[model samples]
Target chain A: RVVYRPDINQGNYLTANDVSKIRVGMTQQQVAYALGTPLMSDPFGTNTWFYVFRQQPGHEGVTQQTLTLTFNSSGVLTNIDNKPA
Target chain B: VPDNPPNEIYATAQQKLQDGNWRQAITQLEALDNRYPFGPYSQQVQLDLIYAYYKNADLPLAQAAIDRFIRLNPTHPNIDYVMYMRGLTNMALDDSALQGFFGVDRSDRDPQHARAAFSDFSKLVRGYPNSQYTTDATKRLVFLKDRLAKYEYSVAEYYTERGAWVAVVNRVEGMLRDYPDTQATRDALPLMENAYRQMQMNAQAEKVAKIIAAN
Candidate 1:
């Protein structure tokens, strides 16, 4: 009567470790290389990038996190939002 | 005495799962299922297969397995978990392939999956109140309820912006009636009031305005 339960992980694998490497002046290419390509770029505009991650029935203390980066028209990063541990 | 061959296969699949090799586990479990379709452990294998498919990101197969299990074992004692997993599967469907990576907000999209998830979670809560998974199911139900309410209001807002006051009124009023205490209702009241004003229904506009003020 063994019941199978597997920890489910989905979305961009970005974590706090990757976020720590991002800096304000970096270009989009630099950010992509540093943190891997984002899960989404702004569909209506090219200046915003979003990275989201979630581990369901969270195992090993992994939880949900989101990172949003905004770039200027010239492609230099200007803003960053990280909301998760 | 040698180990039972089917039992040995089941044990190996369990080991593969513990090793985080979901693909291998799926292969092993599928073999066991086909080889011993009605073995003593058939029910357990079916359940395990669902989990394996889910872990391998094969949602359609996982959902199909759930449907099959429920249909085959209607009165099984552990059917509660199957119902709970059904809710989880349907909830995951709302995340479009691009949504998680693209930051696309689907709150304005069709609420079909949200509706299905809500129904699945509601079934679990209503039918298995004392089950261990009920607490989590209730939490998910609340989340889905709020999401569905917000989705309805998003549609109403779109209608309002497009100057379809009649459609706006219908959408807003339906939201108000169906999801009375949700946060969406707070926004829906104002939208309904505005729609009434735009449509030149001064009496209804004033009534909604008063309700908004009183709240």
Candidate 2:
């Protein structure tokens, strides 16, 4: 496998407590308050912040999922993709 | 036959229809049926001739050919498809009639025309209850209901614009209850809130705004 650039992500850790901080209809302001600004922003207004984590390719009963916070319009926190990075 | 005319005329006709040449296809099917009244593809040629006529906006020919096909093979395996096509031809005619009524001239805005279009659509829905077209026809009926409710709200808007609180409130209440999903309803809510404020109904306006904000 190939290793990606380290600067592309925020960190390697996420918790359910972090998930608890997110809610629907959260604005970008509220999201920055909870998790700080994203490491990268897509120009097309996907506007998602990245939290990069690593996992064994194919997981072979090994790697774990990371928490990624997502916000939507009307200032709501929408989703947390807690899958293996 | 023409000097360089294509063989396999039925396949050629189907190719023309596929290429969106509905008028040319009708011509081909007419020549085929006239030349080979008992050929292997004669029946199918007749069926597609009707479809081509229907697709090209020749409704009388469509209906006539459909009737002939039904009379010739009343128990044909795909008779339902033929009947469905006839029903669709009538439905298309009904759509044209509705378009005429709602034209810019406003010549047929009377209740009689509105009720007639509604009844005609309802007939299509009833006659072809299991056909795939029922889904779209049902959606159009729902949209028709929304338009009816919107007309009432429009009258209320005239009153609201002139600072009439009671009329605005009554009309908006009815509209929000009945057609809340419509675009007009979305615009009406903020205007209704302004009407409430004009009538010294600040508390009611706040409540309504809160509901809108929550949504």
Candidate 3:
């Protein structure tokens, strides 16, 4: 018998287009504005942020990507790693 | 079709599900499950009930359905799908809290569902390596691994901020060891290095620093 399965979309739904707007030296606020708030950040401080997205089966974008952004001690974005390919 | 027979009720439930009547589907399927607990349609009804509950966004019910199915049909050929649904339910539950929709960093929150999803997917992949769902389960396992590691890092950071250097070291070590290849390990190295420095373990601190630099 056929059963219905709902589409699932989770985490910080980012695209390569949105990530392209990010650049080194942007402040945390700017980064937040460019890509929406990250799925997670360093709890003790604001030194790092993680953006992750996953679409479950039967979803349109059954894909996953994870991006990590690092900020210097002064809270300025210094590095971007693991952006979507 | 008579409403009393299991086959008729099951057919009507399937029709209701196809017509996007999730609530009606749930009612009919629940009756089928309760009245004919060992009927021919029992297994199929349990599976359909899981999807109905999930599609209706009743997460707790969906989870309960999955648990019941797994317990009752441990050796069922379609057990893979049941396990996959369990993982999916927990993953969705985790995302509800971890999605950052409310501007809160989920790393600071409890990782209960995330951990459960990780375990569920791990079991599925380990037992059914060639199952069609194995590939997707592997992908989700990676995501959950990263999330669980980050949760551990957050806890370690809490200890670090409180000057509980020993706890920081132990937690970071565990995170690194358990989630070896995750991006969270990349972040944990620096924290471990710093914790060593705070504790006057200069050599250990330098070792971790060198590892971090290499990566």
Candidate 4:
């Protein structure tokens, strides 16, 4: 194993409590209020939001979680998908 | 939550308070105040509710209760007592299991709660010197003052550890000037002296040594 790497945290602290409230019909504004702005936006001109949190700690194993969201042209939340650690 | 008379609920809650049953007391007191929002016992019930939350260590609720009381009764006759309780609650807000068992150095941590307590106690002492709680407020003031000064000293030590001698010099100076009455301020002489010497300023370093000797 490699030497100890100091813990690193990236992106907003998204919780299940907040994510569970995100509904398919929620406006992008409402979603922002419920969870917060997404970590990254799609650069390919798609209406997608990526909420990413990757934590690297020295002692414990790493954590990588991402929530992918899609918005319709009307700005309603169209889909909710998450990849857990 | 009850159809009982305001006095009845207040009495029952007061009994819970008398028994030191804070957990049971809070719910009754909360319901009593809500039921009799403008009743004659409203003010007293509010104070009891705040005390119940405090004794139960529900710090956030205690703070909210205290804030509501202060906001509602700006000229209350028992404002002194409520203010004293506010100080007590804020002081407890800075505690944790580790802090209780190990007596860990709170000086190195953010002491906003301690500072809040200090502000509350200082205001209570000044605005209500004739209050019954002034004596204990005076006592807590001393403790909070010493703790706050030590927090400053801790910051100075951080600068020292970070090899930021100028920041150390400034913080030591700030501590002496602001918190001069506390022992932590006296303890700061060594760091200031070290900083002065490290900066190759022997004159100030010599002056610092003389101050330490005087202390």
Q: What C-alpha lDDT do the candidate models reach, one value each?
A: 0.76, 0.63, 0.75, 0.74
Write the residue-wise lDDT of candidate 1 on B1-215 in tens digits. 22348888899889989899898788888888888888999888988888878777779999988989988879988998898889888888777665577776666577789889988788888898998888878878888888889888877888677544456666676667688888889877888878666534454678788889999
Instruction: Report the candidate with higher TM-score, 2 versus 3.
Output: 3
Stretches of candidate 3 exceeding 4 Å from the true structure: A1-85, B1-6, B97-104
lDDT for residue B187 in candidate 1, whole number 0-100? 73
The per-prediction tally of clashing pairs is 3, 8, 0, 0
Give RMSD (Å) of candidate 2 vs. truth: 21.3
TM-score of each: 0.68, 0.38, 0.64, 0.67
lDDT of 2 by residue, B16-40 (tens): 8999977777777788788778878
Scanning candidate 3 chain B in windows of ten residues, the lowest lDDT window is: B195-204
DockQ, per model, reads: 0.01, 0.01, 0.01, 0.01
* Clashing residue pairs, backbone N/CA/C < 3 A, model 2: A23-A77, A24-A76, A25-A75, A25-A76, A26-A75, A26-A76, A26-A77, A27-A75
Model 1: TM-score for chain B: 0.93
lDDT of 3 by residue, B123-184 (tens): 88889888889888888888788777878877787767754555576677666657788887
The docking category that best describes candidate 2 is: incorrect
**C-alpha RMSD for every candidate:** 21.8, 21.3, 20.2, 17.6
Q: What is the DockQ of candidate 4?
A: 0.01
Task: After superposing candidate 2 on the true structure, give the runs of residues whose Cα lies further than 4 Å from its correct spot.
Answer: A1-85, B1-7, B95-131, B140-215
Q: Best-fitting candidate, measured by TM-score?
A: 1
iRMS per model, in Å, is: 16.8, 24.6, 14.2, 15.5
